[PDB]
């Protein structure tokens, strides 16, 4: 499954300084055109969508989503200890380079693709 | 570090750059036990006369006479 | 009379006599446990010959002797001298009383 | 042909012993042997107070390091210059070459 | 009665000179510390020196200027001005009448407070 | 010292077309970098790492 | 501490490169292997010395660091390093 | 002409107390009524109602 793929993506993309987090950094990382695999999530507002969508798109590179920004805050682990574990949210993501192959990310490129 | 400073001639308006010589106690310290005092400067030692006076004898210093 | 070569001859053998000061201080602190005799160092010629004398010798030699690895690399960077130029030669001390 | 070897060593006998180990040699190659020349020794000196406060009868101390030195000024082939330097070697003795 | 003057020179032309020019004049100490260029900080208390003189006008005294350049020779540019020299613990004021050409700040100021046992 | 507003998520340096092509809605600097954007209020036109203001003759 | 991201994954890595590190203690110079400020070396090993992971021993003027065994495979987890990579 | 800008809900002109008190963050007209705020932009501080702009000595 692809929820598996990503998180080997992610953890090896963030050990490494490669994981950038937050609407504001994607936006000028979109803009200055060195990302891939921006995520998405759910629960934003529609003209916050319309502008990730819009710019995305622009940049020319593959566009993802995720079915809750939960399910993203794993990812970016911001993870934490409750005593058992919870999940600071996060709301979109991107990553700047893979920094060593993984099986994960020939499957996401091949979903893309 | 040799430290700069600028100054200004008599104009108040030209500005010329002078260095700071190293000198006094502010950078021979004790290179056992950071003291700045009682530090003994020849032979290119920077070491306190107590501090000497124990290791004297594994550098190879001896009392002949 | 009067020598040019004396500061120089001078200043070099109480630099030596130091290093071997401060890196028998740092062994003693490290291998107490281990029970740590004594220390050769012979720095005038590469490569720097190390001997220590140890009274038991299985945590230098355990886990693929990498405390040996390591007290090679710690004495590199304080001499400011390539790995490559050490070796280090542990000896059982015999007759220990 | 001339060869210049400065042999010098903080410490008395092993001097001694090592010069007369290369006398030895220079003997048993027998190219007109020497003795060595002994040299004028570097003596370098401080003067420091014994007590770690000012209390009591100020006493002080003078602690000298001797550094011996021996040359031997000496007739070879540039062969046995190359050959015999392997003696040079594993020495608390410092040794320096000179040649024209 | 004649004119204030300095080692020859009057009031007049005195508040005229240069700094440059000025150093003819002084000990030949004081000339040294010139000749050797001024402090950043020296430079900004004479700058507000050169403003204030210009700057006030009519009978109001204009404000004390406060310094630590304890060592810098009194010029004719800060003469008739208020101004508070560092003792180590307050700036002590005083104005900057002629007679006091040819000395440092540091002489007109007590470090250290007069002994009656 | 005083305390500092700010203007949340930054979006209005931008304009776009019916086509979805983008375009600055501000002017921009001759001098900094055509990247860097220029204010506006009253006679006054600004710039940021020069912090220059035109002043306009209107 | 007041490191950067890319200064504190080059401490990292390089004390998974070699198991050791030296600093000079009172020093606002550079460390010569990785171009941080003394200072700010010091203060990140500080924390893996509190968190057991590195041993420290003060000699005269140096702070010599060694990495435990129980702590290379922390730092393994950390530096997200495959689970053959071992130090020199 | 040109096209303008927008910049959303204006809330920037203001700062909030921990107590809840507000303050304006930009400072205010001594000659429009200290309603009119004033911007900044570099050596520029300005003003509406009368266009006016402030050239700083810096
Ligand atoms: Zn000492
Ligand atoms: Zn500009
Ligand atoms: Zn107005």
Redesign the interface.
């Given at each position: 499954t692809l929820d598996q793929a990503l998180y080997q993506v992610c953890?090896?993309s963030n050990?490494?300084?490669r994981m950038v987090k937050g609407?504001?950094q994607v936006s000028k990382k979109l803009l200055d055109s060195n990302l891939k695999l921006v995520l998405l999530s759910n629960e934003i507002d529609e003209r916050?969508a319309n502008?990730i969508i819009?710019l995305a798109?622009?940049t020319n590179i593959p566009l993802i989503k995720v079915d809750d920004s939960i399910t993203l805050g794993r990812y970016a682990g911001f993870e934490k200890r409750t005593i058992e574990i919870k999940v600071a949210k996060c709301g979109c993501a991107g990553i700047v380079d893979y920094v060593?192959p993984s099986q994960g990310q020939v499957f996401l490129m091949n979903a893309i693709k | 570090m040799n430290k700069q400073m600028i100054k200004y001639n008599a104009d108040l308006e030209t500005t010329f750059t002078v260095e700071r010589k190293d000198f006094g106690r502010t950078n021979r310290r004790c290179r056992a036990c950071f003291a700045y005092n009682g530090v003994i400067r020849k032979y290119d030692l920077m070491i306190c006369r107590r501090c000497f006076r124990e290791y004297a004898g594994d550098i190879g210093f001896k009392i002949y006479d | 009379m009067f020598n040019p070569e004396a500061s120089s001859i001078k200043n070099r053998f109480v630099e030596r006599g130091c290093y071997y000061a401060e890196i028998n201080e740092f062994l003693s602190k490290l291998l107490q446990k281990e029970g740590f005799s004594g220390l050769s160092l012979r720095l005038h010629e590469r490569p720097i010959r190390v001997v220590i004398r140890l009274e038991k010798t299985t945590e230098v030699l355990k886990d693929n002797s990498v405390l040996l690895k390591q007290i090679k690399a710690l004495i590199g960077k304080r001499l400011q001298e390539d790995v490559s130029n050490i070796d280090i030669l542990i000896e059982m001390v015999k007759n220990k009383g | 042909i001339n060869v210049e070897l400065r042999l010098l060593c903080s410490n008395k006998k092993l001097l001694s012993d090592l010069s007369n180990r290369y006398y030895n040699y220079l003997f048993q190659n027998s190219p007109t042997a020497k003795k060595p020349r002994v040299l004028q020794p570097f003596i370098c000196d401080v003067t420091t107070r014994k007590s770690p406060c000012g209390q009591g009868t100020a006493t002080w101390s003078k602690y000298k390091m001797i550094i011996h030195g021996r040359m031997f000024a000496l007739q070879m082939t540039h062969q046995m210059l190359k050959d015999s330097a392997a003696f040079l070697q594993n020495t608390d003795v410092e040794v320096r070459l000179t040649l024209k | 009665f004649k004119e204030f003057s300095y080692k020859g020179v009057n009031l007049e032309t005195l508040t005229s000179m240069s700094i440059s020019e000025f150093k003819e004049l002084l000990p030949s100490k004081l000339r040294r510390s010139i000749n050797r260029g001024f402090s950043a900080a020296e430079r900004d208390f004479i700058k507000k020196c050169i403003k204030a003189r210009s700057e006030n006008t009519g009978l109001e005294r204009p404000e004390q200027i406060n310094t630590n350049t304890r060592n810098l020779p009194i010029l004719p540019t800060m003469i008739g001005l208020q101004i508070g020299v560092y003792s180590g613990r307050d700036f002590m004021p005083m104005v900057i009448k002629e007679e006091m050409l040819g000395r440092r700040l540091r002489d007109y100021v007590e470090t250290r407070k007069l002994c009656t046992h | 010292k005083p305390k500092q507003d700010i203007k949340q998520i930054i979006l209005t340096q931008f304009s776009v077309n019916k086509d979805g092509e983008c375009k600055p809605l501000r002017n921009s600097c001759s001098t900094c970098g055509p990247s860097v954007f220029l204010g506006r209020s009253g006679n006054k036109e600004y710039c940021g790492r020069c912090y220059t203001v035109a002043i306009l003759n209107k | 501490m007041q490191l950067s991201r890319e200064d504190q994954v080059a401490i990292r890595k390089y004390l998974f490169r070699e198991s050791i590190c030296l600093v000079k203690d009172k020093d606002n110079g550079n460390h010569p292997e990785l171009n941080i400020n003394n200072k700010q070396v010091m203060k990140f090993l500080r924390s893996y010395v509190s968190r057991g992971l590195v041993e420290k021993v003060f000699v005269w003027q140096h702070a010599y660091f060694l990495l435990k065994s129980e702590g290379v495979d922390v730092l393994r987890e950390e530096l997200y390093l495959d689970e053959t990579e071992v130090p020199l």
């Open positions: 953890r090896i050990a490494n300084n609407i504001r916050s502008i819009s798109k622009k060593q | - | - | - | - | - | -």
